[PDB]
Amino acid sequence: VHEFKKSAKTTLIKIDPALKIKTKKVNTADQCANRCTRNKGLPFTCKAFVFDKARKQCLWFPFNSMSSGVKKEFGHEFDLYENKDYIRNCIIGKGRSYKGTVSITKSGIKCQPWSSMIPHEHSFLPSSYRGKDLQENYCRNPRGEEGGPWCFTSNPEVRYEVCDIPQCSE
Amino acid sequence: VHEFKKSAKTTLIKIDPALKIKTKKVNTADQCANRCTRNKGLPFTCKAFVFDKARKQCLWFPFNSMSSGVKKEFGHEFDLYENKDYIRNCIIGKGRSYKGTVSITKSGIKCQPWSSMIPHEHSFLPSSYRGKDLQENYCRNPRGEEGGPWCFTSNPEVRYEVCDIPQCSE
Incomplete structure (x- = not known):
């Protein structure tokens, strides 16, 4: 399941x-x-x-x-x-609309949950953003920025990191 | 596994x-x-x-x-x-390059395995389709025919049927 x-x-x-x-x-x-x-x-x-x-x-x-x-x-x-x-497990453009379940950054760090404020504090709570699917600890790109889906890191040494998801054009 | x-x-x-x-x-x-x-x-x-x-x-x-x-x-x-x-779980154009593991037809029937002649007999052996990944019972599109990845059915009443594979960009 x-x-x-x-x-x-x-x-x-x-x-x-x-x-x-x-x-x-x-x-x-x-x-x-x-x-x-x-x-x-x-x-x-x-x-x-x-x-x-x-x-x-x-x-x-x-x-x-x-x-x-x-x-x-x-x-x-x-x-x-x-x-x-x-x-869709690949990206279209800047991944603005990615809804996949990849919960890990390029270097393998387990993504910190969007709702969590530990270990890092951020403004990216679902509440603010909507239809952005900032749930669990999925890699997302709420501000459709250049790096593509990213997430905050479960590691104190690292606040955030881009994730490793391919473009559909591979 | x-x-x-x-x-x-x-x-x-x-x-x-x-x-x-x-x-x-x-x-x-x-x-x-x-x-x-x-x-x-x-x-x-x-x-x-x-x-x-x-x-x-x-x-x-x-x-x-x-x-x-x-x-x-x-x-x-x-x-x-x-x-x-x-x-990649979505289709690029026609789909000749699909490599996913979807193995169920547009209507719910499990695909017959390619290297099998039961229930249906065919000539779509990997041998005649290198680089086409006709393995297991995965929905494929070896001839890039406009129907999209498809497969021989386990149901004797249905020889083949297209698969419900989403297009990547639309």
């Missing part, structure tokens, strides 16, 4: 009955994942799934949050899981 | 004095994949690892077989494992 990008308190909504959806029920969300991964009995390619922890179920989709004709919606009983296979 | 594209009897050499590496003695390829996915204790972004069956050791690298600074060379005691995370 760690082979998915997790967005807490989130579910997906499409208003177009075209994109089909399958739904069931479980024990653990891990069950939902392992099942989206193998794409077992799905009339489609499972790119994301929700675990409505309220109705112990799974919500498999043939799309994710970056898919047109879709929008995110808050829900404390939900937890959204996007299959890393459909979240 | 299931989230790594394997290449038997293959290791990697760095033509770049710069490019660094790390090695260690271990009991199984399995243990190496772990450390790499979790990118733990590595002075860098682990984009692949090779396992030496002979000496029993891992070699974690900050590059993979597509990284400019390297070339691959034969070795019976070597298996190369590239992490999905750094193998």
Whole structure:
């Protein structure tokens, strides 16, 4: 289930009955994942799934949050899981819109979380920036700057470092 | 080791004095994949690892077989494992160069393996398509035909079907 990008308190909504959806029920969300991964009995390619922890179920989709004709919606009983296979893992331009899960800098330092102020204090809290996906400790480029996705470092010696993500034009 | 594209009897050499590496003695390829996915204790972004069956050791690298600074060379005691995370998962133009591991059709059926003649019989053997990576059961586009990467289906009722592979820039 760690082979998915997790967005807490989130579910997906499409208003177009075209994109089909399958739904069931479980024990653990891990069950939902392992099942989206193998794409077992799905009339489609499972790119994301929700675990409505309220109705112990799974919500498999043939799309994710970056898919047109879709929008995110808050829900404390939900937890959204996007299959890393459909979240572009390379960069377009200055990586302004990168949404991948790479959480490490070029020299391998584990990225410090955007919400954290330890070991470094910064102004880049999600609150300020929006739709910038400054969650967990993902490499991002909130100010679409030249270096591309970067992050603050879990190391006191180093406040920040650019990450090592390829341009889609490789 | 299931989230790594394997290449038997293959290791990697760095033509770049710069490019660094790390090695260690271990009991199984399995243990190496772990450390790499979790990118733990590595002075860098682990984009692949090779396992030496002979000496029993891992070699974690900050590059993979597509990284400019390297070339691959034969070795019976070597298996190369590239992490999905750094193998472009979107399509450039038609897709002839796709190398991802997606192996499910636009509609949810698991691809039939290329080097298999069941359920379907075909001539798309690697032998007739070098540099086209027709390995395992991965969605490919050996003929660059305008349909995009595709694959023979495990379902006897469906011979082949295109795969749901996103375009990189749109």
